[PDB]
Amino acid sequence: PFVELETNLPASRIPAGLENRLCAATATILDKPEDRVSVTIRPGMTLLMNKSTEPCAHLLVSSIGVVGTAEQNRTHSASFFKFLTEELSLDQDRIVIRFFPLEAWQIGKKGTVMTFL
Amino acid sequence: PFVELETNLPASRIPAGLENRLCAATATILDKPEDRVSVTIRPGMTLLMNKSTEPCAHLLVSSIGVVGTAEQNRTHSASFFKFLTEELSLDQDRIVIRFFPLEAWQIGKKGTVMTFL
Amino acid sequence: PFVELETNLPASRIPAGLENRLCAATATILDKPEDRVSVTIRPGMTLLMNKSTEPCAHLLVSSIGVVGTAEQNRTHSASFFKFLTEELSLDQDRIVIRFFPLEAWQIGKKGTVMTFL
Ligand SMILES: *c1cc(-c2ccccc2)ncn1
Ligand SMILES: *c1cc(-c2ccccc2)ncn1
Ligand SMILES: *c1cc(-c2ccccc2)ncn1
Ligand SMILES: [Cl-]
Ligand SMILES: [Cl-]
Ligand SMILES: [Cl-]
Ligand SMILES: [Cl-]
Ligand SMILES: [Cl-]
Ligand SMILES: [Cl-]
Ligand SMILES: [Cl-]
Ligand SMILES: [Cl-]
Ligand SMILES: [Cl-]
Ligand code: NA
Ligand code: NA
Ligand code: NA
């Protein structure tokens, strides 16, 4: 899986180790091996949500066949929201998630793609 | 909708309130409620366009069923281009747009997904 | 094509001209005109890979009908990996690639979309 957290919060205001905790949370929420989860945090960007620029964040979740249905994404969202709101000290209205399902043929590792690994 | 503007222009060189104006422009161009439009600006990144690193920008537009056909995207592009070129003081050749259609099941809000809202 | 390199390496530690060289490498690897290749580099972001935050990078490759099959992506990956590992001084285990196929109708240029150009 790939998890990206983009926020208008400055790096300094972002809880140390958030990437680690988020890595773990992801593996659990999506039920994928922790050591294959990639976390990326882009802090200090300019963000506007609900015509407001108070602190807020976007969470992008990309994974293979686990985020392709409103069914499971609802469950995921709940978990992630619970995680982020807590960690970042933000209210639900200041967090949005986007799920992108992927396929092994589009993921490249060790000079090839998942498909041949 | 989700609008992301990534540029090699420094934050300082980016017109104050651009996110607000872009938020409004988006709602109009795509005909979606203004209060549900998310704008993100990543300034000061390294960008190369046409083997050149002079100022330029990328606009990413994600929305539900309104950017899925060359038909409507042509209309959108025209509007967005008119907006950006003006605002950013860039020529057409220094701006590129990418449209990504989305589906409520992949958008998470308030601990669930659009699908159940 | 669109190539994005996101890394936890600081801008200063990123080899001067990397975008240019990467632009060229892309055109070659994907066999698309060099002057239509867009390169973006986001340095100094927070990245965790294999539960580790040592230097690492993500490469996102978006293009029209050339990165849609494990077949060709394997070839691409090999090339890109060879390029990045070399340039960035990173081992294979610290680089991940993601391929996103696109369609002219979703790419906007000169106030319209590729489709009408
Ligand atoms: C998330 C997970 C993976 C992956 C790769 C190998 C084995 C398990 C999981 N790849 C990309 N993103
Ligand atoms: C753009 C628009 C929306 C949205 C959500 C609720 C009601 C209207 C529009 N969501 C995501 N992106
Ligand atoms: C990559 C390549 C192109 C493009 C545009 C015009 C002519 C050739 C190639 N567009 C977007 N990304
Ligand atoms: Cl920051
Ligand atoms: Cl902001
Ligand atoms: Cl996965
Ligand atoms: Cl800046
Ligand atoms: Cl630049
Ligand atoms: Cl929408
Ligand atoms: Cl940096
Ligand atoms: Cl890091
Ligand atoms: Cl292309
Ligand atoms: Na951070
Ligand atoms: Na800005
Ligand atoms: Na750079």
What residue segments make up the domains of chain C, in order of their start? 1-117
Nearest to B74 among C36, C102, C113 (CB): C113
- The answer to whether residue C69 neighbours chain A at the CB level (below 8 Å) is yes
Probe site for chain C from A106, A114, A117 (most C CB atoms < 10 A): A106
Neighbours of A35 (CB within 10 A): 11
Q: Do A20 and C51 touch (CB under 8 A)?
A: yes
Q: Do A99 and B105 touch (CB under 8 A)?
A: yes
Instruction: Assess whether the C-beta atom of C58 lies below 6 angstroms from ligand 3.
Output: no
Probe site for chain A from B21, B23, B105 (most A CB atoms < 10 A): B105
Cβ atoms of A30 and A77 within 8 Å: the answer is: no
- The answer to whether residue C97 neighbours chain B at the CB level (below 8 Å) is no
Q: Name the 3-class secondary structure at A16.
A: coil
Name the CATH topology of B1-117: Macrophage Migration Inhibitory Factor (3.30.429)
Those of residues 29-48 in C touching chain B at CB distance below 8 A are 34-43
Pairs of CB atoms within 8 A across A/C: 94
Nearest to B81 among C2, C43, C111 (CB): C111
**Residues of chain A neighbouring C70 (CB-CB closer than 8 A):** 104-105, 113, 115-116
CA C62 / ligand 12 centre spacing (Å): 7
Q: Do B70 and C42 touch (CB under 8 A)?
A: no
Residues 6+ apart with CB under 8 A from A29: A76, A79, A80, A83
Assign 3-class secondary structure to chain C.
Answer: CEEEEEECCCHHHCCCCHHHHHHHHHHHHHCCCHHHCEEEEECCCEEEECCECCCCEEEEEEEECCCCCHHHHHHHHHHHHHHHHHHHHCCHHHEEEEEEEECHHHEEECCEEHHHC
Give the closest residue (by CA) to ligand 3 atom 7: C36
**Residues of chain B neighbouring A67 (CB-CB closer than 8 A):** 106
Cβ atoms of B45 and C20 within 8 Å: the answer is: no
* Residue C117: burial class (beta carbons within 10 Å; 0-12, 13-18, 19+): exposed
Cβ atoms of B95 and B59 within 8 Å: the answer is: yes
Q: Which residues pair with A59 in a beta bridge?
A: A5, A97
Q: What is the DSSP string of A29-66?
A: HHT--GGG-EEEEE-S-EEEETTB-SS-EEEEEEEESS
Probe site for chain A from B38, B45, B114, B117 (most A CB atoms < 10 A): B38
Q: Do A40 and C51 touch (CB under 8 A)?
A: no
Distance between CA C69 and CA A101 in Å, rounded? 16
* Structure letter (DSSP) for residue A15: P
Give counts: helices (H), strands (E), chain A.
2, 7
Q: Which residues pair with C5 in a beta bridge?
A: C41, C59
Give the closest residue (by CA) to ligand 1 atom 2: A1
Instruction: Assess whether the C-beta atom of C35 lies below 6 angstroms from ligand 3.
Output: no
CA A107 / ligand 8 centre spacing (Å): 27
Q: Name the 3-class secondary structure at B41.
A: strand
Question: What is chain B's alpha carbon radius of gyration, rounded to the nearest angstrom?
Answer: 15
φ and ψ at residue C31, rounded to 5 degrees: 65, 50
Q: What is the sign, positive or negative, of the torsion defined by CA atoms of C68, C70, C75, C79?
A: positive
